[PDB]
Ligand binder design. Structure first.
Ligand SMILES: CCCCCCCCCCC[C@@H](O)NS(=O)(=O)OC[C@H]1O[C@@H](n2cnc3c(N)ncnc32)[C@H](O)[C@@H]1O
Length: 398
């Protein structure tokens, strides 16, 4: 069986001295050997905190090496990580904590006021036994052992619970296993043009499924993650050039706001090849602007339930199929479910997905889980059309 945590170790075996995590703003630089060593300390810390295989560990903190190492460490233990959106208010964070039955919460200094509010409320999440802030994590990690854990786990064992974007009415925990995450990161590494030793810019919050899949897929391919904790458009370009970024993740808005700053006018980053985007189509204009600087753009379509995987639109078809979500990526099949309940490869209907990247279930939501599955196919709830060329077009929501 595959184990996301073991994979980090294996990467540290293959490329021990390869730069794995680069964070300028904080001057935090680490090789894969060091990152894997930090995860082991993280695993030791969690164990002493009473975390056992299956147990949930909440992570409320800014992007950081600690975040990645904590879930990687959790992965080696068979524990389940619950990364939480840091823009969330106390009552919502509290909801996620009790719904997930998290027993340990690791939080950053910026989230202290949120953790304090929850702890002062009437009826705080009963399952939480420890609230570990930045200071305590530092203290604990310092006396932590760096030994490699020895726990047979992985495969279909839970690894993460990602709660569906804020609200739409039904906030649910999306549970992914080592296999579904492995398959997703595998899908990405096999679909987009990623290369060993490439340097990739991650400006997205690490609680986001796409971002999570990015740090994991980076370890799998042996990519140097370039971290920009809090996106800042006044520094993003110099980071791209000074750190010799080859690939960058972003949303259409960011890119449109980025080709505006002064630094853009005469940008000269030889190493930078393309941006990956999703969540909204890319305006033919915004594309051409970037095509100008010889910068390519790949656009994808995915959900939390698909672990950030799904369809993708290669640059070459950006204008030819502008307004399209692309085609199915490696290791994943996409089609449409009619009103007759019949699934077809072409035509309009509800976009359905069949791949190993799919969630195991909705955390403690039996009915929702069974209603999202139809003979192996996951119903996205999105209406769309697939043309004879096999390109997907996202319409309204079912
Ligand atoms: C192999 C590499 C794959 C790279 C995939 C990058 C995906 C970036 C977006 C991730 C979205 C994922 O996080 N799910 S979600 O919780 O954010 O929301 C999912 C919903 O967002 C919408 N929705 C996502 N992408 C789109 C879209 N490209 N075009 C119209 N709509 C969309 C659609 O309603 C979908 O059901």
């Amino acid at each position: 069986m595959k184990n996301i945590g073991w994979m980090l170790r294996q990467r540290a075996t293959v490329s021990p001295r390869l730069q794995a995590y680069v964070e300028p703003s904080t001057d935090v630089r680490m090789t894969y050997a060091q990152m894997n060593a930090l995860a082991n300390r993280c695993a030791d810390v969690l164990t002493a905190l009473g975390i056992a295989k299956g147990d949930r560990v909440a992570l409320l903190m800014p992007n950081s090496v600690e975040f990645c190492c904590l879930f990687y460490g959790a992965a080696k233990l068979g524990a389940v990580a619950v990364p939480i959106n840091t823009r969330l208010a106390a009552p919502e964070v509290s909801f996620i904590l009790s719904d997930s039955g998290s027993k340990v919460v690791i939080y950053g200094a910026p989230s202290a006021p949120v953790i304090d509010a929850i702890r002062a409320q009437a009826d705080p999440p009963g399952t939480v036994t420890d609230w570990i802030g930045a200071d305590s994590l530092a203290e604990r990690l310092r006396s932590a052992a760096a030994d490699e854990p020895a726990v047979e786990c992985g495969g279909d064992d839970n690894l993460f619970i990602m709660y569906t974007s804020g609200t739409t009415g039904h906030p649910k925990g999306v549970v992914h296993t080592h296999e579904s995450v492995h398959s997703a990161a595998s899908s990405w590494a096999s679909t987009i043009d990623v290369r060993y030793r490439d340097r990739l810019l991650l400006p997205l919050p690490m609680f986001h499924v796409a971002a999570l899949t990015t740090v994991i897929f980076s370890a799998m391919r042996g990519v140097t993650l370039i971290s920009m904790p809090q996106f800042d458009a006044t520094k993003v370009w110099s980071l791209i050039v000074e750190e010799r970024v080859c690939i960058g993740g972003a949303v259409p808005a960011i890119l449109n706001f980025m080709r505006q700053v002064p630094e853009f006018a005469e940008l000269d980053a030889p190493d930078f090849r393309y941006f990956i985007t999703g969540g909204a189509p890319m305006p033919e204009a915004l594309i051409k602007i970037y095509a100008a600087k010889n910068i390519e753009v790949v656009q994808g379509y995915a959900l939390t339930e698909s672990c950030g995987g799904g369809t993708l639109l290669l640059s070459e078809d950006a204008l030819r199929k502008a307004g399209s979500a692309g085609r199915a990526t490696m290791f994943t099949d996409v089609a449409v479910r009619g009103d007759d309940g019949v699934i077809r490869e072409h035509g309009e209907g509800e976009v359905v997905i069949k791949s190993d990247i799919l969630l195991k279930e909705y955390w403690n939501r039996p009915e929702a889980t069974r209603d999202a599955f139809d003979n192996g196919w996951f119903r996205t709830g999105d209406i769309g059309e697939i043309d004879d060329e096999g390109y997907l077009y996202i319409k309204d929501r079912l």
